[PDB]
Amino acid sequence: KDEEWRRAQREWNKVWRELEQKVFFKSLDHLGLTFKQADKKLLTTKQLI
DNA sequence: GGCGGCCGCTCTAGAACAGGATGTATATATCTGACACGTGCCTGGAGACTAGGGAGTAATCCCCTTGGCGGTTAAAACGCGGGGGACAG
């Protein structure tokens, strides 16, 4: 059971690390994820007046 | 001495309780009539073979629905007045 468990963990590790590499920096960004709409919502005319 | 208040007597009666009534649920006796087992086939699918063609998969592409916003006038919702109708009788 440990042998097959370690083998399955090893074959999980590559795809798991590949997903983590692209999802961790997305998880770090909080305001930048909503900045695609915040930069248009807060930067208008009437907001500036 | 007369009259209002209080309590006992008596008529009325609401509704639970017991007995009669009639159509079914059961307790055998026996018929009975299809039910399933056996037999004899015999007719339809399975092993095996020939050939092929429409989808799984891969690729493209372009398309089209979701997210995501201001805007503004149409309207949902809250509330006041009230009005006619569902239901109790």
UniProtKB/Swiss-Prot annotation:
Other notes: Present with 1660 molecules/cell in log phase SD medium.
Subcellular location: Nucleus
Coiled-coil stretches noted in the UniProt entry, renumbered to this chain: none
Full protein name: Transcriptional regulatory protein SIN3
Function, in words: Catalytic component of the RPD3 histone deacetylase complexes RPD3C(L) and RPD3C(S) responsible for the deacetylation of lysine residues on the N-terminal part of the core histones (H2A, H2B, H3 and H4). Histone deacetylation gives a tag for epigenetic repression and plays an important role in transcriptional regulation, cell cycle progression and developmental events. SIN3 also has a RPD3 independent function required for normal longevity.
Source species: Saccharomyces cerevisiae (strain ATCC 204508 / S288c) (Baker's yeast)
Subunit structure: Component of the RPD3C(L) complex composed of at least ASH1, CTI6, DEP1, PHO23, RPD3, RXT2, RXT3, SAP30, SDS3, SIN3, UME1 and UME6. Component of the RPD3C(S) complex composed of at least EAF3, RCO1, RPD3, SIN3, and UME1. Interacts with ESS1 and STB1.
Gene of this entry: SIN3
